[PDB]
Amino acid sequence: VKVKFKYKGEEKEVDTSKIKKVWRVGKFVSFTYDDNGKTGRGAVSEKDAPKELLDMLARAEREK
Amino acid sequence: VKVKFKYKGEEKEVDTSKIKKVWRVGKFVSFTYDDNGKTGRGAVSEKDAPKELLDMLARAERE
DNA sequence: GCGACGC
DNA sequence: GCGACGC
DNA sequence: GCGACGC
DNA sequence: GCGACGC
């Protein structure tokens, strides 16, 4: 599963398996990911978020 | 529990796990914290402080 | 003023 | 030693 | 504001 | 070391 979002006008795509941290900011889902070793930031609206990312977020909010 | 504060125009947030000294100034809670490598300073009105910070304050004052 | 980093 | 958080 | 790597 | 995702 890949998340597609544009960040800084450029469109990006990220495999959910590389997502490291996930959190909610209003109506969007914010996250960090492992981009070939280095860590990047990405975000996507909650409505456009793959279900797998939403599961990740729910899991993150429950453990704290 | 994180502490939200505004410092030098910037809204910031810090975990209480990283807050060190805490003291009261009139009606606000002042504190220092680990800002990886250096100690930062933050402050929030008591009315807006989370319980955990106020608890740390009570502890500091009782010492 | 109240309490307590970076110059 | 002195300037730079909420009220 | 909201939460938490790119200049 | 400070600050630049949707509404």
UniProtKB/Swiss-Prot annotation, chain A:
Lys-4 was 70% monomethylated in form 7a, 25% in form 7b, and 20% in form 7d. Lys-6 was 50% monomethylated in form 7a, 40% in form 7b, and 50% in form 7d. Gene3D superfamilies: 2.40.50.40. GO terms for cellular component: cytoplasm. Hyperthermostable. Transmembrane segments: none annotated. Keywords: Cytoplasm, DNA-binding, Methylation. Belongs to the 7 kDa DNA-binding/endoribonuclease P2 family. NCBIfam families: Sul7d (NF045555). This is DNA-binding protein 7d. The lineage of its organism: Archaea, Thermoproteota, Thermoprotei, Sulfolobales, Sulfolobaceae.
